[PDB]
Structures are given as structure tokens and as C-alpha cells.
Design a protein around this ligand. Structure first.
Ligand SMILES: CCCCCCCCCCCCCCCCCCCC(=O)O[C@H](COC(=O)CCCCCCCCCCCCCC)COP(=O)(O)OCCN
Ligand SMILES: CCCCCCCCCCCCCCCCCCCC(=O)O[C@H](COC(=O)CCCCCCCCCCCCCC)COP(=O)(O)OCCN
Ligand SMILES: CCCCCCCCCCCCCCCCCCCC(=O)O[C@H](COC(=O)CCCCCCCCCCCCCC)COP(=O)(O)OCCN
Ligand SMILES: CCCCCCCCCCCCCCCCCCCC(=O)O[C@H](COC(=O)CCCCCCCCCCCCCC)COP(=O)(O)OCCN
Ligand SMILES: CCCCCCCCCCCCCCCCCCCC(=O)O[C@H](COC(=O)CCCCCCCCCCCCCC)COP(=O)(O)OCCN
Ligand SMILES: *[C@@H]1O[C@H](CO)[C@@H](O)[C@H](O)[C@H]1NC(C)=O
Ligand SMILES: *[C@@H]1O[C@H](CO)[C@@H](O)[C@H](O)[C@H]1NC(C)=O
Ligand SMILES: *[C@@H]1O[C@H](CO)[C@@H](O)[C@H](O)[C@H]1NC(C)=O
Ligand SMILES: *[C@@H]1O[C@H](CO)[C@@H](O)[C@H](O)[C@H]1NC(C)=O
Ligand SMILES: *[C@@H]1O[C@H](CO)[C@@H](O)[C@H](O)[C@H]1NC(C)=O
Lengths: 308, 308, 308, 308, 308
């Protein structure tokens, strides 16, 4: 029971898992469908070229990735940087979580263990007493926690960082991947440099990109996935903005818990909200919190004074 | 015994397993029989083309996937989107189950554990008494559960989501894969764009799709599998519509259980039906429910007042 | 001892294992000897064709698999559907077993556990008594089981399903694989569709199938294996038709067991036969059934009244 | 608890992990994108060359990697030494850590175990006494440790070695990888040696490097990663320069601990700072340090003389 | 504690690990960069040769590896024997260690176990006595060990063998790999034997070695690594030449240990030095040697007569 503590809500965990796995899935798709068919470019070299010269033209145009529209010099860099760039995004998706693992895990774990121990002690004391009432240690600890703003700060910072990263991805896709999104074929010239005076090669060679459809699908999948993901992040952020009133009558099962929950009204930015959410996520400790859930469900002289 | 609890019926589990594994099996078949023979297209380039130019024509026609019937511009997109699209379907098949894992598992598990503990206590009390009769806690809990509509809502929503996804797959197959289901060969033109003024290539190049038979088999397998799967989902949905009368005499083994089962008649949309189905699936707890099964089987002064 | 219970006879288990593994072995052989040498077809394209045009003719004739005998239009589909079709057969071989796992395993396991517990109790009682005689619970349970027809129905249905599937495979092989069993080479025309007006290709191109011998060997192996397998299924079916008289004197070791075995004569379609077969398969529980085997072997005042 | 001791701060551990994994990640990228497309060079051999002669020219120019600008003889060695050189860097990143594992781990571990044992003993003594005050062993050990300069020397040496290695990498990149950073194509002559009198090959053959973009990306990633990493190393170095005053009131929980912490002011180069940092990293030993954290948090007659 | 005994110093272990792993790392590099690009030779066969004849010339010149400078017949064997030769070196690096594992491990382990048992017994006796003084068994054993010269002989022989092997590698590199270290291209004649009268092939064919740079890097890495490794071996050898005076005051913690350490001065070739080094490496047995380390550190009426 003690070792089964969860440091995050299941919704937040699954959101992080999706936001990390989707870029890696696209990475696997790219590295599987890119180098299993050669290179993502095929160049229509003239007939008089040998096979080696055609391969050289292919490699040179793949490396240059320049457009010679006519002098316009538009570039098509993203098609070659599509995997690696997304890799950075993956690392970005793993940046706040590590922060959460190195800024709130120890304090939250210690507080949760202390709170669960005090809850077990209070339950045992109530069991003995039904057959002294108030806790000064818990009251002082709750009064202190109602003033600190550490865990709430870490939570809001993590969510804001994730939202900012998603917005940055939106800006990247909407600024770099729509001026190229309809480029089927492009000209390419290898008449720059030492081969300038050569007359054996044409001035302009057309080449069509093979992986255009794959790139389009990857971009659309990314934007759709992050559009689906953002509202859940918004909901997880606004969950802290509303107090845990839905379980207030639950705290009524013990008048001491009610006194701890006296004057819960106030500004919802405090450690208390996070603690309440985590204990709600931990309402199945071994059997005792299950009994608490049963009694609060049936509550909605009670149960002949708790079976005496 | 406690750790061996099952959160779903074996029929529902096997249905989910089939509905998830079949798209993945088709994915494996597609990625195995598609890129082990090159690309799923072969283009009859003229004899004067070199090998590199023929490969360029092949890649360009594979990417474009356009038809120039004669100006008609029908497309043949699904043959290139057949795997990826089905992948979404796979994710869809995994969408409701996660919902079931994040909307009913904790409450159902807690209720099942509490019910099994109370059943063990009642069995021990009856064993002591045969050698006080009524339970107020169980009566109140059953009265409360007869009013709630949470687990029934989750079950019906999951089944409805699965049925809706199957219907959507039916619509997709019947709207996109029959206008292409008899396309052996198609024309393709690379005379669009920079190569417009080139006179070294023909205006129309015919190409025949290699993976036509594989695509046909995949579509037929999908439709047949989901046709086989839908009636079992219908049966699992209608199981809730009929009360668990088949075991009513079983509840007669203890008059307290009969009183709990008093007035079972009513509208069958309640948590009680799901609880009854799960306890029926859990009639082999350690040895005691086995003894209950033996006694109810032989029942169909009884057994000299339960061996005194 | 309790966890080592077997839910099927070793002969039935090995028959199922063979019937499942043989199609998968043939699948492995097909996918290993088919795509390790290219495609199972080689087409004698004329000399004037380039390599790309020859490959296109190869792929087109492989996909079409048509015969233009001369207009006759016989097809040679099975050579391309040989693996996938057999895969269905494999699933068919796994269909009844799952039925057996979802229609008789729980009831049989519960009954076997109860019977073994009662046998241990009766052995202990006899050991105490040799140094009250009749069991009413066991007598009533055996009387009830002599009337039910569930496990016998499941067993007969499983065996009938397996036999029907084998007969269907026989019909498939004898109706589809003998009109093709001597097709070495076949004509193939790609002059259908857009290439109709082309004069660069011949009207008829001959192609010889590479995997003819492999297909012949696979078909012969399948028919031989299922011919070897069917009589064992017949024997397993007829085993139920004869009562377990071979161990009747074994039941004489205890007169209570004889009274349970009183009036064993009757129609052999009952749960009792299956229970007797399974307990015969479980005559080595820990040491006690071994002692029973020793005493019944030596039986063929006995053993000075069981060593007093 | 005893076996869960940590020998380094989480920030230092993650910094070392990044500094080791990044070169290995670049190594994997290089060996994956270099030999999956042949060799990182394509040479425009003339048309009259056969395929074997073209391959020989390719290999010779790849091995020579010389430039014949016109006699200038600039070399382009790094493009061929890019992986192996970075491998040395990886080993360099693993050099100080091994030093830390072979110069401070045993003494630090022994001191930490002794200190934690004495802390447990002092806590037990205080618990007994609240319901003799000073420790001479701990006082003498702290007085001795305030004079030694071993662990501080090892820590500063490790950080200085890492900083020096990073500076060396900076110098290497800024001295070797900017005179080549814009070399797309280069001439290459195989008319040196035995082929000097041959007239079948040209005097100068142009070749363009395929992996130019990959090399550029690798260099930029390396410099950016180490720029991000250096300030954290600076912070970890300057952490020792400031005394652990933030927890001084924590030492006030026991006046004996305060007396141990008497005259903490002084020059911050001593083993005491490292010991304080490690015990701060170990403020969650089993439950007792958690209670200490709770009491020091709530402190900011106290707690009715520690619950009496 | 008993099972955690170390049979070698960490420095010696890491030196052996490096000296074994470096040749294997070079082996992996050679077999990875040699046969992933064909063969380490490319021969400029004339244009009139077909591809098969060019491949035959390539293979023949690779096998012969002869030089026909002009009749000089210098050979270039090492480029083909570079991996296999180094493999012998690897085995050589594993030769002395096995000797150390089969000439000193059992006796050293037995002596260390006996010594640690006697040390524990003496510590317990001192603990009892502080609240008979001399050991005759230990005194006699130390007197006997001061005369034997077995473990010292094995240690010196192992170090001398490693040094001799390193010197042999130095001689090999300085005698075989500098007359070839600047061979880019070499002539090769296949006009020896049956093809002597053939007029279809030239008399001399030039070939350039592809793996020249790789061989150069391997040789330089080997020489640099062994240059770095030799001084540590020298230090490990000279460590035995100086007595363990640095811990003499440590032996003063017990006057019995001092008497055992009486007359430590003498010629440093004895088992006693190795035993002292190993016990110094084992000063963290469970907790007791840690306490000894603490007391000897704080020593630099003592500690109120060891806390009485
Ligand atoms: C965190 C990762 C975020 C990376 C941000 C990339 C920013 C893109 C570069 C700035 C865009 C810009 O200045 O305009 C473009 C120029 O880019 C260019 O000239 C081409 C830039 C090529 C490098 C950028 C892609 C590599 C990024 C990979 C980073 C990975 C490092 C961390 C692992 C368009 O200009 P134009 O093309 O129209 O005019 C070319 C005429 N000559
Ligand atoms: C959830 C997944 C469900 C995806 C739903 C796909 C809908 C199909 C597109 C709409 C159909 C439509 O508008 O008409 C077609 C146009 O499609 C087109 O023009 C081609 C559309 C190409 C993209 C669609 C396939 C990719 C889907 C993959 C989604 C994966 C993302 C999540 C992982 C036929 O028009 P026409 O061809 O006759 O006329 C072409 C003349 N120019
Ligand atoms: C359960 C699996 C059992 C599958 C049963 C297959 C039945 C074979 C089709 C019916 C036979 C038939 O009607 O006559 C043939 C026509 O078949 C044809 O025209 C060719 C049919 C091609 C599709 C059948 C093979 C694919 C089966 C794979 C099923 C897998 C789905 C489940 C995973 C001979 O007619 P003919 O050739 O002489 O005249 C062609 C002139 N145009
Ligand atoms: C620790 C690893 C650090 C390695 C340090 C490498 C130093 C680079 C060599 C010195 C630079 C130098 O002297 O000037 C260059 C000459 O280098 C040259 O002539 C080419 C040197 C080729 C070998 C260096 C690369 C291999 C390094 C791998 C070491 C790995 C060993 C440990 C695993 C430029 O002169 P120039 O090119 O302009 O004039 C050529 C006219 N002929
Ligand atoms: C322990 C391993 C140590 C191996 C020691 C190798 C010694 C090298 C051979 C002796 C050197 C020598 O006699 O002079 C050379 C002759 O070698 C030659 O004629 C070529 C010798 C070819 C075989 C040597 C390389 C294989 C070694 C592999 C051993 C592995 C076995 C254990 C696993 C130079 O003479 P030249 O070339 O100038 O004149 C050729 C005119 N015809
Ligand atoms: C090959 O065709 C090109 C036109 O793209 C021409 O410039 C070149 O001279 C031709 N070479 C030969 C050998 O025919
Ligand atoms: C090759 O044939 C095509 C006809 O498809 C023709 O347009 C082209 O000029 C021909 N080229 C040569 C070099 O024969
Ligand atoms: C090649 O031979 C075929 C006969 O199969 C003939 O129809 C075609 O015209 C020939 N083409 C050439 C270029 O010789
Ligand atoms: C091939 O062209 C080269 C010019 O690069 C010339 O030196 C050589 O003699 C030519 N050889 C033949 C056989 O045409
Ligand atoms: C090819 O060239 C070689 C010169 O290296 C000459 O000896 C041989 O006779 C030539 N053969 C032909 C068929 O031109």
C-alpha cells in the first residue's frame, strides 16, 4: 500500500505518455519509410548520363535542396530536417516532467506519507473512542500548508511550460510547413562551383520528392494530436481553480476532519488543493479508505452509531 | 483469490482482443508484403528510358496516384493510405477500453471487494448459527445501489461507442473501397509542372498496381471479421436488459440473500445487474462459492439441514 | 497436486497441438521459400524488352494469374491464396478448443476439486474406521450428475466441430487443388485495358510457376497429416460410447465406492463418463491414489485387512 | 534505507548522464546515416569510366580527402574523423566520474553511514530524555572534518576537469570545424604515384560530400548542448562557495545540533559543506527525517514540548 | 561481507579491463568498417575488362598483396593480418590474469578469510577486556609468512609478463607498421603462373588501399593507449617496493597489532606487503573496520579509554 503511491493523476500521466510517444511513433515511421526505399528524392537525369553521374546528381540535389524558380532562391530545408526537428520536440515534451520529478516529488511524497500515517492514527483513535477529539499537529500543519505556495507553483509552471511548448509547435507548423505543403517537383542546379564551366550537364534538372505524402501525413497527425491534447491540459489546469467541494460532506464523517476543513473557502492557489486531489486519488489505501468510501456513499443516528 | 479478480466478462475480453488484434495483424501483413517486393506499383515506362528515368517515373506515379481518364481526375488515394488509416481504427478499438479502465474500474473493484468480504462474513455467521439474521449494512448498500446509474451508464456507453466505431468502419469501407475495388491499371502523367515543355517523355504512362489483391483480401477480411463480431456485442448489450432470474433460486440458499433479492423485478438499468453478473463470474472465489455451487446444483429438510 | 490438474487427455492435447502446429509449420515453410527467391513466378519476356518492362510483365502476370487457353478464362487463384487460406484453417483448428475453454473448464474444474476433496475425506474416514459407511452428499451429487447432459454435450460438440472442419478441408483440397495440380506453365496477356492499342508487347506471354513443387508438397502433407489425425479423433469420440468397466473392480476397493458405482449400466451419454475418464487421468494425486493403484494391481482377507 | 544511499546530487547525475549520452547519440546517428547510404562522398567521374573505375575513383578520393585549389593542399580530414574523435570526447566525459568513483566514494560512504547511525542514536536519546546532552565523539569528528580538505578537493577537481574538457571541446570546434563548415564540393586528383603517366583519367575530378548537412547538424547540436550544460556546472561549483545557512534553524531543533553547528562561519572549503549537502539530499531516511522535516516546516513552548 | 572479497586492487582491475577491451574495441571497429564497404582494396582495372574480370583482378591483388616496384618484391602483409594479429595480443592480455587466477587466488583467499576471522576475534576480545593480550597463532603465522615468497613471486611475475607483452607490442608496431605507414597505392601483377602467356591483361595494375586511414588510426590508438597504460603498471610494481608505513600508527590502535607490526623494517619482498595491501583494500568489512577507520582518523587517555 505504501509503495503503491502515485505521484500524478492518471489523466496527466496518459497525456504525458501520448505527448511523448506520438513524436517517437512519427520518428519510427519516418526512419522506416525513408531509408527502406533509398533516399526521399528522385531526379530525372538526362539519358546521356551514366548511372554513377545520375546518382551524383541525385545526392547533390538532395543535399542542396534549393529551388531556382525563374533569381529566386527559395529553400526546402524542412523535408530533410523533419525527423531531427521533431526529436527536439520529443525532448521538449520530456523537459517539464523531469522538472516535476526534481522539484515536487520528494516534498509531496513526504507530506503524503505523513498525512496517511496521521489518517491511520486518527481512524484508530476514532475506532477506540466510539466504543482527544482535536489534533494540534495536523491543525498546525494544515495552517502552515495553507500559506505555502510551492507545489501549486510547480504544478502551474509545468502546465504552463507544456502549453507554451504546444503553442511553439503550432507556430512552427503554421510558419514553416505551409509554404512547402504543395511542392511536388522542384528544379535543382549543380552548375555552382567547380562544375561551372562544364558543358556535359544541363543547367536545370527537375526532381520530385518521394516523401511528400509522408511529410503531409506526419504534419497533419501532429497538429490533430496536439489539438486533441490541449483541452485536457486546460481542464487539468482549471481543476485547481475550483475547490474540492464535491467531497466536503465526506470530511463530515469525522467532526475533526470537518474542523480541519473549516473555512475551506478562499483563493484556490495553495498546496491544500493539490494535497486534496492526491488523497482523492489515494482513497483505496488498503481497506480503510474503501470503508470510508462505502460509508460516505451510503450516507447520501447514522448506521446505528457506526455499528457501535 | 483476492488478487485474481476479473474486471470484465471473458466474452467481452475476447471480443476486445479480436477487435484490437485483427487490425494489427492486417498491419503486419501489409508492411510485410508491401516493402518486401519494392513498391506496390510497377510502371510500363517506354524502352528508350534509362533505368534511373524509369525509377523516377515509378516514384512520381506512386506519389501522385492520379487517374487521367479521357478531363477526369479521379484519385486512388486509399491504396497508399490503407495501412495508416487502419492504424487509426486500431486506436479507435483501444479508445473505449481505456475509458472503461478510467471510469468504472476503481468503484467496481472497491464494491466487489466489500461485497465479497460481506459474503464471507455472512457465510461464517450462517455456519455458526446453524449449529442476527438480517444485515442492515448490506440492505442499505443495495438500496443505494438500486438508485445509482453510474456503472450501467459506463457499460452502455462503452458498448455504444464500440458499435458506433464499427458502423463508421462499415461506412468507410462501403463509401471508399468499392469505387476502387476493380482498378487493375491506370494512366499517369508526369507532364505537369516543370517537365511540361519536355518532349523526351510520353504524355500518358500506364501503371498497374501490384498490391490490388492484397488490398482486396484485407478489406474482405475486415468486413467479415466485424460482421462476425457485431452480434456478440449486441448479445452483451442485451444481457443487461434481462434480469438474472436464472440464479434466483440460488439466492434462496439463505433467506437473508432472498430478502436482499426481494423485489428484484423492475427496470433493468441499474448497478445491481452489473454486480450480479460480476459475482456470477466470481462464483469460484476460493472453496466457499464452489460449495455454494455444489449445494445449489444438488438442490434442483434439505441435505439434513446442511449437515447440521 | 491441486494446481497440477489436467483439463484434457494427453491424446486429445497432442492431437490439438499437431492440428494447430502443422498449418503454422506449412505457413513458415511457405513464407520462407516464397520470398527468399523473389516471387513464385518467372515470365519469359521477349529479348527486346528492357529489364523494367520485364519486371512489369512479371508483376502483372503474377497479379492477374489468368489463363488464356485457346475464349477460355480459367484462373489459377489458389497458388496466390495458398498461405492465407491455410491461415483460416489454423484459426478453425483453434475455434473448438476456445469453446472447450469457455464452456466446460470452470464447471469441470469445480466438480473435480469437490470430488477430490470428498475422495480424500472418504479415504481418511476409511483409514480411521479400519483400525458412517455411506455418503449421502456424494450419492445425491452422483444421482444429479447422472441426469445432466452438459459436459457430454460440450465434448461431443467439440469433437464434431473438429471432424466437420477436417471434412471441409478434405472437400476444399479435393475440389480446388486437383484441377491445378498439373499446371507447369500458363499463358498470360497484358493486352487488356489501356495497353490494348500498344504494339510493343506480344499478345500472349508464357510464364512458368516456380512454387509448383512446394505447393504440391504442402497439399500432400496436409492431406496425409489429417488422414493420420482423423482415426484418433474417432477413437476419442467412441471412448465415451463404452463405459469404464475396466476399472469396476477398482471401485470394489471400498464398498461405498461400489454402491456409488451401483447400476453403472445404462446409456453412456452422461457427465459420469467424462468424470470417470478425468479421475482415471488423475490417479496420481499425491501419494494416496498411487497406493490405490498399488492395492488394485496386487488385488488381481485381502492384504491382512489392509495392514490392519 | 541504508542501501538507498545516493553518492551524488540528482542535478550532477543528470548533467553527467546528458554529457555522456549526447556524444553516444550523435555516434549512433552518424553510424546510422553514414553507412546506410554507402559512403559519405559521391564523385562525378567522367562518362568513359566503367563502373569499377568510378568506384575506384570514389574510394581513392574518400581516402585522400585532399583539396587541390589552384599549389594549395588544404585537407578535409575532420569529415572522416568526426565519429572517432567524438568517441574520445565520450571517454573524456567518463574520465572524471571514474575518478569520483575511485577517490571519494568509500570515505564518503563510511562517513555518511557513521553520521546516520549517530543521528539515529541521538534521536533515540532525545526521545528518551524528553519524557548526556552533548556528544564528544561527534564533536571531535566534526572538529577533525573541519580541518581536512579531501572531499572538497576531489569535488573541485572533478568539476574543474569537466569544465576544462568542455573548454577543450569548444576550442576544437572553433578551430577545426569553421574552415570546413562551407565546403560543398572539392577537387581531387588521383594522378599521384603509379598512375602519374596514365592518360586514361583526368587530372582533376570534382566530388561533393554527401554528409555535409549531417556534420553541420552534429556540430551545432554539440555546441548548443555544451553551452546549455556549462552554467549548471558553474552553479554546482558555486554551491560549495556558500554555506548551508538555509537550514541553520533546522539545526536548532536540537541544541546539541546547534552546538555542533556553532561557529559555522568561516572559509567554505571543507568536508563539512559536502557532508551537509549529502545529508540534505538524505532527509528522507526512513520516517524519522520526514518527521524532522515536518517539525521544521511547522516551526516556521513549541508543539507542547514535542508532544511530551 | 565475506562474499564481497576482492582479489585485486581497483587500479589493477581497471588496467586489465582497459588492456583487454581496447584490442576488442579495435577488432569491432575493423570488422565493422572493413566488410561493410566490400573489401579494403580497389583496383583500377582497364576499361576493356568486364565486371567479372575486374572483380577477379581485385580479388587476386587483395590475396597477393605484393609490390612490384621497379626486381623488388616488397610485401604488404600486415594490412590483411591487422585484425587477427591483434587478436593474439588480446589473448596475450588475458594470459597473465588467468595465471593470477590459477596461482594465487586460493591461497590468498584462505589467508584473507583466516586473517579476517582472527581480526574479528581479537576485536571481540579487546571489547571484552577494556570493560591474553598476545596471540601466539597470529604471531607464528606472521613469522612464517615473513619467510615465504609465493604471492610476491606471482605478483611480480604477472606484472613482468604484462610489461614484456607491452614491450613486444611496441617492437611489433615499431618494426612492421612504419615501412608501410605511407603506402597509398601499389602495383600488382597477375602475370604469374598460368596467365603468363595471356595478352588480354596488362603487366602491371595499380591498386589503392581503402582502409589505409583506418589502419593508421588503429595503430596510433594502440600505441597511445599502451603508452598511457605502462606508467600505471610501473606504479603498481613499485608500490610493493615501499612498506605500508602510512598506516603504521593505525596498527598502534592495539598494542598487540603493534607487536605483530614490530620490526616491519626489512627487504620489502614478502607476502606481508601483499597481505597489508589487500587488508587495506578491505577496511570496510561490515561496520567494525569502519569504526577502526573513524578512530584512527580522529586519533590524528584517548576517547576516554574507548568509551570505557
Ligand atoms: C529547438 C529547435 C528549434 C529549431 C528552430 C529552427 C529555426 C529555423 C531557422 C530560421 C528561419 C529563417 O531564418 O528563415 C529561413 C532561413 O533558414 C535557413 O536558411 C535554413 C536553416 C537550416 C538549419 C535549420 C534546421 C535545423 C534545425 C535542427 C535543430 C536541432 C538542434 C537540437 C537537437 C528561410 O529563409 P530562406 O530559405 O527562404 O532563404 C534562403 C536563401 N539563401
Ligand atoms: C480518423 C481517420 C479518418 C480519416 C478520414 C478521411 C476522409 C477522406 C477525405 C475526404 C473525402 C473527400 O472529400 O473526397 C475525396 C477527396 O479526398 C482527397 O482529395 C484526398 C485526401 C487525402 C488525405 C486523406 C487520407 C489520409 C488520412 C489519414 C489520417 C491519419 C491521421 C491520424 C493518424 C474524393 O475526391 P476526388 O479524389 O474524387 O477528387 C480529387 C480531385 N482533385
Ligand atoms: C473461410 C475461408 C474459405 C474461403 C472460401 C473461398 C471460396 C472460393 C470462391 C468461390 C469459388 C467459385 O465461385 O468459383 C471460382 C471463382 O472464384 C473466383 O472468381 C476467384 C475468387 C478470388 C477470391 C477467393 C480467394 C480468397 C479467399 C481468402 C479468404 C480469407 C478471409 C478470411 C481471413 C472458379 O471460377 P473461375 O476461376 O473458373 O472463372 C473465372 C472467370 N472470370
Ligand atoms: C584526444 C583527441 C584529440 C585529437 C587532436 C587532433 C589534432 C589535429 C592534428 C593537428 C592539426 C595540425 O597540425 O594542422 C592540420 C594538419 O593536420 C593533418 O595533417 C591531418 C591529421 C590527421 C590525423 C588527425 C585526426 C585523427 C585524430 C583521431 C585520434 C583518436 C585517437 C584516440 C582514440 C592542418 O594542416 P593542413 O591540412 O592544412 O595541411 C596539410 C598539408 N599536407
Ligand atoms: C604471436 C603472434 C606473432 C606473430 C609474429 C609474426 C612474424 C612476422 C613474420 C616474420 C617477418 C619476416 O620474416 O620478414 C618478413 C617476411 O614475412 C613474410 O614473408 C610474410 C609472413 C606472412 C604470415 C605472417 C602473418 C600471420 C601471423 C598470424 C599469426 C596468428 C596465429 C595465432 C592465432 C618480411 O619479408 P618481405 O615481405 O620483405 O619479403 C618477401 C619476399 N618474398
Ligand atoms: C547527351 O545529351 C546532352 C543533352 O542533355 C548533351 O549536352 C550531350 O552533349 C550529349 N552527349 C552525348 C555523348 O551524346
Ligand atoms: C525514344 O522513344 C520515344 C517514344 O516513346 C521518343 O519520343 C524518343 O524520341 C526516343 N528517343 C530515342 C533516343 O530514340
Ligand atoms: C522487338 O521484338 C518484338 C517481337 O516480339 C517486335 O514486335 C518489336 O518491334 C521489336 N522491337 C525492336 C526495337 O526491335
Ligand atoms: C573518354 O573521355 C576522356 C575524357 O575525359 C578521354 O581522355 C578518353 O580518351 C576517352 N576514352 C574513350 C575510349 O573514348
Ligand atoms: C582492351 O585494351 C587493352 C589495353 O589495356 C588491349 O590490350 C586489348 O587488346 C583491348 N581489347 C579490346 C577488345 O579492345
Amino acid at each position: 500500500r505504501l509503495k503503491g503511491l502515485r505521484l500524478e493523476l492518471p489523466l496527466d500521466r496518459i497525456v504525458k505518455f501520448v505527448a511523448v510517444g506520438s513524436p517517437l511513433l512519427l520518428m519510427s515511421l519516418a526512419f522506416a519509410q525513408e531509408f527502406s526505399s533509398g533516399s526521399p528524392i528522385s531526379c530525372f537525369s538526362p539519358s546521356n548520363f551514366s548511372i554513377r553521374q545520375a546518382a551524383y546528381v541525385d545526392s547533390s540535389c538532395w543535399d542542396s535542396l534549393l529551388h531556382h524558380k525563374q533569381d529566386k532562391m527559395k529553400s526546402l530545408w524542412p523535408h530533410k530536417a523533419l525527423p531531427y526537428s521533431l526529436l527536439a520536440l520529443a525532448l521538449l515534451m520530456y523537459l517539464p516532467v523531469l522538472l516535476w520529478q526534481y522539484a515536487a516529488v520528494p516534498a509531496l511524497s513526504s507530506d503524503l506519507l505523513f498525512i496517511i500515517s496521521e489518517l491511520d492514527k486518527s481512524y484508530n483513535r476514532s475506532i477506540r473512542l466510539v466504543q482527544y477529539f482535536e489534533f494540534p499537529l495536523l491543525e498546525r500543519y494544515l495552517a502552515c500548508k495553507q500559506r505555502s505556495h510551492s507545489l501549486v507553483a510547480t504544478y502551474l509552471l509545468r502546465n504552463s511550460l507544456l502549453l507554451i511548448f504546444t503553442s511553439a509547435t503550432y507556430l512552427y507548423l503554421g510558419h514553416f510547413h505551409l509554404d512547402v505543403f504543395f511542392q511536388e517537383e522542384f528544379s535543382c542546379s549543380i552548375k555552382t562551383g567547380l562544375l561551372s564551366d562544364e558543358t556535359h550537364v544541363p543547367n536545370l534538372i527537375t526532381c520530385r520528392l518521394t516523401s511528400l505524402s509522408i511529410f503531409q501525413i506526419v504534419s497533419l497527425s501532429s497538429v490533430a494530436i496536439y489539438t486533441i491534447l490541449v483541452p485536457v491540459i486546460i481542464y487539468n489546469l482549471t481543476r485547481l481553480c475550483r475547490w474540492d467541494k464535491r467531497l466536503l460532506s465526506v470530511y463530515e464523517m469525522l467532526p475533526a476532519f470537518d474542523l480541519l476543513s473549516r473555512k475551506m473557502l478562499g483563493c484556490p492557489i495553495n498546496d491544500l488543493n493539490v494535497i486534496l486531489l492526491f488523497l482523492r486519488a489515494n482513497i483505496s489505501e488498503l481497506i480503510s479508505f474503501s470503508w470510508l468510501s462505502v460509508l460516505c456513499v451510503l450516507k447520501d443516528v447514522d448506521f446505528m452509531t457506526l455499528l457501535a
